[PDB]
Design a protein around this ligand. Structure first.
Ligand SMILES: COc1ccccc1N1Cc2c(nc(C)c(CN)c2-c2ccc(Cl)cc2Cl)C1=O
Ligand SMILES: COc1ccccc1N1Cc2c(nc(C)c(CN)c2-c2ccc(Cl)cc2Cl)C1=O
Ligand SMILES: *[C@@H]1O[C@H](CO)[C@@H](O[C@@H]2O[C@H](CO)[C@@H](O)[C@H](O)[C@H]2NC(C)=O)[C@H](O)[C@H]1NC(C)=O
Ligand SMILES: *[C@@H]1O[C@H](CO)[C@@H](O[C@@H]2O[C@H](CO)[C@@H](O)[C@H](O)[C@H]2NC(C)=O)[C@H](O)[C@H]1NC(C)=O
Ligand SMILES: CC(=O)N[C@@H]1[C@@H](O)[C@H](O)[C@@H](CO)O[C@H]1O
Ligand SMILES: *[C@@H]1O[C@H](CO)[C@@H](O)[C@H](O)[C@H]1NC(C)=O
Ligand SMILES: *[C@@H]1O[C@H](CO)[C@@H](O)[C@H](O)[C@H]1NC(C)=O
Ligand SMILES: *[C@@H]1O[C@H](CO)[C@@H](O)[C@H](O)[C@H]1NC(C)=O
Ligand SMILES: *[C@@H]1O[C@H](CO)[C@@H](O)[C@H](O)[C@H]1NC(C)=O
Ligand SMILES: *[C@@H]1O[C@H](CO)[C@@H](O)[C@H](O)[C@H]1NC(C)=O
Ligand SMILES: *[C@@H]1O[C@H](CO)[C@@H](O)[C@H](O)[C@H]1NC(C)=O
Ligand SMILES: *[C@@H]1O[C@H](CO)[C@@H](O)[C@H](O)[C@H]1NC(C)=O
Ligand SMILES: *[C@@H]1O[C@H](CO)[C@@H](O)[C@H](O)[C@H]1NC(C)=O
Ligand SMILES: *[C@@H]1O[C@H](CO)[C@@H](O)[C@H](O)[C@H]1NC(C)=O
Ligand SMILES: *[C@H]1O[C@H](CO)[C@@H](O)[C@H](O)[C@H]1NC(C)=O
Lengths: 727, 726
């Protein structure tokens, strides 16, 4: 029997199959098999080829992706795709008319389009081009311009800027159609006085002079972008007149200082909900805006507003939660931290004050997945008191106490981690367990939660894994001060609790993180355990999430304290286990995990012989406002300046004398600037500490290009193996 | 028994003593001692104290340097010193009156001045501030503004842009007083269309990285342009501006891109100007006379001196300096002869051709002084050792009477001299650099009598007798019937029966020389003494001081023979019985780093490992003046093919055969970090693993105290590992 080797991991020799589908109605869904796009009936399982992979053989461009209009009539061909940041990019587009079997050839969508999206019904298009918004009521009709103010790196209409893209919307898009198709709401961003990060991009050998990349990026404390909201009426567009935009002013509690627009959710055809958050993320407001057919304007009755405060920490897991509106848009449901700081579901009625908790307990609700008039379906880590497990639940809207678990028992030994995808109106649902066994895709009717069929069992991957000495995962918990904190171990094949093994500590450790879970990974850690017999361990300590505010907020205004502290205490416990050679304990982490890995190696605990830190953060003034200020406040003497400076990696350099440290960073990192690792290395040199390094030309935070990804794991494997006297 | 250790190298435990004097007339010099400035009498040797080490204890500023006026009356005080490039910087200046014994506080020189200079006689000042030239006739008086066009990073008056500073003048200054103090000649640089090198500077507390921007022509890019001006300082109105008379380049230059590469005043009214075509194989020397009548300066086309070259470029790194006889009507300069050896040549203004006054299989290194009877020069004639330097004189009245002034002084200890003459050369200080400890002595020119010893380094010698120092061998091998010299730093108690690891120390750039007789205490010393590594260097094809046939071997084909030859030399060292061919490393810095890369990437088979510090990776990345000299232009009609065939990136597959360590500073304004960034990327892309280290905010020199200590420690760890050393 062969082991799970580094090549296996880098070459992706053992692939996980997936069943990713798109619900197209209350009972159909699309699925792409062999580059053929098929429609499926959910009740019966029958299918028809909707678009045959042969269809576009003579197109003249590699087609990167596709989007089909809600009403099945047209399809968008995305090509010439060029990636910008995490979510943002630009591309070329073409539209194919189905019931005509041809390409619309005039009023073509412009090249270098930054965003496109169908109205939720029919076949309208909104697109963003040169930071300006455009609308095509019909695919071959000339589009109407919505905004004229757009300017590169300065004014953003309909798309986010760098920090809203990354920290607020987790999307490039800033465009929300009304469920109807009538209204197109859009955000607008002004970065006029936001400071630029600048770095060299070397590009192909053939480029003589390096290019300097300039990106508006507010470092913690810096001037943030400002934001405006507008709603356009897409029916009354004059080919003759400029479309007129109605602005929705932020609440007064917001305009008294820096604030972010943090959520946009349409409730009815004529009601829109806007959520806002203060620059100090202590305090958010939900506005509710109704449309006046007489006026033509939108009004956010002040008395309607819902206010969300937190005194122990910040608001939300990462942001104020999403509202789930009932059909008549007169009520809605929202995840809220309860009186014991455990996150639960709340029932809100519009024009009533306060709210009602429909769930409670020492566990947390991850998400609301579907609403009907009888049932709310949600995900949570309640089952078997395991914070790292996930299940599908429904609660009777008529009787809160009548809560039933849909996923808990389907395969209790293979599946303890599910996510879900419902059809419109919630007739059917696809479940997806990620572990601890192989991933399993199942379909279900909602009427009597009966299993219709298996969609993907990963039988093939299972077969392969037979011939391989796979490692196992333990998932237990230690006790620190009469509290449970969870941990996972990727044990080597043929594990023996008598023999001593070297242990690599895998950390991320960031606010609301979770590294001990029941999901099945094939990763580097897998190779390390299978082939090199290394026990790779992860631990969720103070500040980790999904265990209520007590734990997750321990770290508030104090990054680089308990979570660092606890990665170390955890290690201690781990030597006390009779199979850990404590002379061979490494640590390593990426991004936030790298900041932590560095603070650990620099603490002097003596526990760790070595570690790697990949694209770490080194000083919180170097990271972005929205994320950093969320946990740290502002870096001023009036706020939290002291701990900002007490919490840097540079100030710990001396102790790095005690360990072999490897430091890695991509030169093109637009997120955690190479700066951060530059300052780390300088501090080390300025104090005479040897250490090892490796920079990656033109790689970003992900160091995810094929070559680079191969190279970095290779380099890191060499380092760990050397550090462990491994053959 | 102790060895020369890394800590010794880095903490400067065994200090070389020096003797740096500043000739201030024909028979006195100046010398710093307990931070006391002494004046010494050359003939007799007596000294008195010229500046008390207590004079400015109340200055409220750390003094960087001093500069005494020609006439002895005033002294300049450099403080607030801020380094820029290799020669340029800024500082504050105060002028101290010696007769009055006080600080002139009227019409002071501005903070952030870019350059200052006394006239050659008298006590005039020329300074450059905000890229404009100013002139103070008297210390206390208002300055006069000569230029008005100065403009940061665009218009340079009286100072050089980046590439002139580094590659052309080896100086920030572009001002040249006439011998009188009457005329001020300056040059002017326009970098308007010169592209910018951009990089980050991270610095300290600083939230956003700073982006640095330097006009910097890479190979083939738009070069700066140059103009030349002369001003009459005697006639400066406090009311009207200052007329600057322009001298224009010859027409054989204006056709296209050219450089002003030399400015030499011959007399009070004759200026010598050298110009060089951007294709550096042709240069014109103009001779320009003043006209008391017309004011203009005229360069008779009739009397131009023209230099061409078929086998290479003109001069060693540039056309050579002319040394005019006092009357200004003849001059001497070093010129390649019929068999391509560089000897001294006598030129008469208005007569064709020149007359060689020296010949032979060796070369003149430089012309040191000129008197009515003798010309003094340094050469490597003695013993036919190209890596030796000796001082000579030749009787102007009989070219065949040539006297060696240094050879026999101490033939054992002293085979490498430099010289410093007094104004007029009644005396000279000889300076010996090896192979023994450095020796500083003084001599009278009258009949070359030895006057006294100045520094003999006895202190150091005594300290070193306690340590197991390495010895140095210096020899040659023959390849294809040619002698190629090399040296080795050999471990103490060296035992030819034993086997040693061998580290090839490489530079190897055109006209370089790594095998000489100089005495050094450096990293290679520690490697040999403590770690018992043989550190070797080899002067192969392309190296200097041995005639054009070797030095031009590399013309338009950089990254070929100098590399091949480095490789062959290492083969030849294995052939010698004391090398363990299983442990043979290679390292170099700058041009050395590039060569070290090409070698490692040759799939030679010979090198187990190597380190490259701030290497070049492809020649288009490097500066125009330097690169276009050896390579021509990177165009299809010129030498673009070999530009393309001579990069490091293209040899990346071959590195899967070596342990490679690549190092470079982030703020390297000279060899841009770029070059390394492109190397690593090529290695990532082909799957080759390799070690690396960057240095935040270090330049080409990586010479800050911490950075310096850090890299040498790091590089030692690497070499010890590569050689399995305990
Ligand atoms: C599983 O998490 C990881 C695992 C491994 C690498 C990176 C990740 N990270 C880190 C991360 C991710 N996603 C977002 C949106 C953000 C916040 N911008 C962040 C983030 C959070 C804090 C700091 Cl200091 C820097 C960064 Cl980049 C992500 O996926
Ligand atoms: C024996 O020389 C060294 C020995 C050791 C380190 C540096 C040096 N170098 C290299 C060097 C030096 N001085 C000048 C003026 C120049 C000209 N650019 C250069 C130079 C030459 C070629 C290339 Cl590719 C790049 C550079 Cl920087 C110097 O001292
Ligand atoms: C983006 O915001 C900037 C900064 O507020 C605005 O620029 C200012 O405009 C007003 C009126 O023109 C004046 O205060 C100044 O002349 C400008 N100040 C600055 C800093 O430039 C700008 O109007 C905004 N752009 C948009 C599209 O709203
Ligand atoms: C420096 O050089 C630049 C061009 O290299 C000169 O600017 C040009 O000069 C002409 C004539 O004055 C102008 O019409 C153009 O606008 C300029 N062209 C460019 C490319 O800018 C400039 O005059 C020179 N300055 C000095 C002091 O010599
Ligand atoms: C006193 C006098 O005339 N000085 C002139 C000044 O007017 C002008 O600013 C400059 C333009 O080059 O030349 C100088
Ligand atoms: C295209 O579709 C056919 C089925 O009609 C399929 O069998 C074929 O392999 C597909 N080719 C691909 C994967 O592009
Ligand atoms: C499924 O089967 C029925 C019976 O033919 C048919 O009406 C329907 O169109 C089929 N659905 C799909 C998705 O092909
Ligand atoms: C709309 O406004 C734009 C920009 O202000 C202006 O150019 C134009 O007059 C308006 N469009 C039309 C044609 O009415
Ligand atoms: C959609 O809603 C708006 C406002 O409710 C209305 O003006 C428009 O006519 C509606 N269109 C449809 C699809 O009925
Ligand atoms: C437990 O309590 C001790 C003492 O109060 C404290 O130092 C330590 O950090 C605590 N550990 C945890 C994880 O709560
Ligand atoms: C040297 O001695 C002579 C004779 O005393 C004296 O006049 C002269 O000033 C002395 N020079 C120095 C440098 O002290
Ligand atoms: C130099 O700088 C300092 C800054 O305080 C200033 O006080 C001083 O006057 C300056 N000298 C000149 C020449 O202005
Ligand atoms: C130097 O030479 C120039 C040549 O024209 C002359 O005018 C001037 O008077 C001389 N200066 C001195 C100091 O003798
Ligand atoms: C010796 O000759 C061969 C070709 O005959 C050549 O490859 C090599 O470069 C020569 N070596 C030297 C140092 O000239
Ligand atoms: C974009 O450029 C393409 C080439 O990919 C060209 O054929 C086309 O005309 C452009 N598209 C539009 C709609 O501007």
């Amino acid at each position: 029997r062969k082991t799970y080797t580094l090549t296996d991991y880098l070459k992706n020799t053992y692939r996980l199959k997936l069943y990713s589908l798109r619900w197209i109605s209350d009972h159909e869904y699309l699925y792409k098999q062999e580059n053929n796009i098929l429609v499926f009936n959910a009740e019966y399982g029958n299918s028809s080829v909707f678009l045959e992979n042969s269809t576009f053989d003579e197109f003249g461009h590699s087609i990167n992706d596709y989007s089909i209009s809600p009403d099945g009539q047209f399809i968008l061909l995305e090509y010439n795709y060029v990636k910008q940041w995490r979510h943002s990019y630009t591309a070329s587009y073409d539209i194919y008319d189905l019931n005509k079997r041809q390409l619309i050839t005039e009023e073509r969508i412009p090249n270098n389009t930054q965003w496109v999206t169908w109205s939720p019904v029919g076949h309208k298009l909104a697109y963003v081009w040169n930071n300006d918004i455009y609308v095509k009521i019909e695919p071959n009709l000339p589009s109407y311009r919505i905004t004229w103010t757009g300017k590169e790196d300065i004014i953003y209409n309909g798309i986010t800027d760098w920090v809203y893209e990354e920290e607020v919307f987790s999307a490039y898009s800033a465009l929300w159609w009304s469920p109807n198709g009538t209204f197109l709401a859009y955000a607008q961003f002004n970065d006029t006085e936001v400071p630029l990060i600048e770095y060299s991009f070397y590009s192909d050998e053939s480029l003589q002079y390096p290019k300097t990349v300039r990106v508006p990026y507010p470092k913690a404390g810096a001037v943030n972008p400002t934001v405006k909201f507008f709603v356009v009426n897409t029916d009354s567009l004059s080919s003759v007149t400029n479309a007129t935009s109605i602005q929705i002013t932020a609440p007064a509690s917001m305009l008294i200082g820096d604030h972010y627009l943090c959520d946009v959710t349409w409730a009815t055809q004529e009601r829109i909900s806007l959520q806002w958050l203060r620059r100090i993320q202590n305090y958010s407001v939900m506005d509710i805006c109704d449309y006046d057919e007489s006026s033509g304007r939108w009004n956010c009755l002040v008395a309607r507003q819902h206010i969300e405060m937190s005194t122990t920490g910040w608001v939300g897991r990462f942001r104020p939660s999403e509202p789930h509106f009932t059909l008549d848009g007169n009520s809605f449901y929202k995840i809220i931290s309860n009186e014991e700081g455990y996150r639960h579901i709340c029932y809100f009625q519009i024009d009533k004050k306060d709210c009602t908790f429909i769930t409670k307990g020492t566990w947390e609700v991850i998400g609301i997945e579907a609403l009907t008039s009888d049932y709310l379906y949600y995900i949570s880590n309640e089952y078997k008191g395991m914070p790292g497990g996930r299940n599908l639940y429904k609660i009777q809207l008529s009787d809160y106490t009548k809560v039933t678990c849909l996923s808990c028992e389907l395969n209790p030994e293979r599946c303890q981690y599910y996510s879900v995808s419902f059809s419109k109106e919630a007739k059917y649902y696809q479940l997806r367990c990620s572990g601890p066994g192989l991933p399993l895709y199942t379909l279900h009717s909602s009427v009597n939660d009966k299993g219709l069929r298996v969609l993907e069992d990963n039988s093939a991957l299972d077969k392969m894994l037979q011939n391989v000495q796979m490692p196992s995962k333990k998932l237990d918990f230690i006790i620190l001060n009469e509290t449970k904190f969870w941990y996972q171990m990727i044990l080597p094949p043929h594990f023996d609790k008598s023999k001593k093994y070297p242990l690599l500590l895998d950390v991320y450790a960031g606010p609301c993180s979770q590294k001990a879970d029941t999901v099945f990974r094939l990763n580097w850690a897998t190779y390390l355990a299978s082939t090199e017999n290394i026990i790779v361990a992860s631990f969720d300590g103070r500040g980790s999430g999904y265990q209520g505010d007590k734990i997750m907020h321990a770290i508030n205004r104090r990054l680089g304290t308990f979570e660092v502290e606890d990665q170390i205490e955890a290690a201690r416990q781990f030597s006390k286990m009779g199979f850990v050679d404590n002379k061979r304990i490494a640590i390593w982490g990426w991004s936030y995990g790298g900041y932590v890995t560095s603070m650990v190696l620099g603490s002097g605990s003596g526990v760790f012989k070595c570690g790697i830190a990949v694209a770490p953060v080194s000083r919180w003034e170097y990271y972005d406002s929205v994320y950093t200020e969320r946990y740290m406040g502002l870096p001023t003497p009036e706020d939290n300046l002291d701990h900002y400076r007490n919490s840097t990696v540079m100030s710990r350099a001396e102790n790095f004398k005690q360990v072999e440290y490897l430091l890695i960073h991509g030169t093109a990192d637009d997120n955690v600037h190479f700066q951060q690792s530059a300052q780390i290395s300088k501090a080390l040199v300025d104090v005479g500490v040897d250490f090892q390094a490796m920079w990656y030309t033109d790689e970003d935070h992900g160091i995810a290009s094929s070559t680079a990804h191969q190279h970095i794991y290779t380099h890191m494997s060499h380092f760990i193996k050397q550090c462990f006297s491994l053959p």
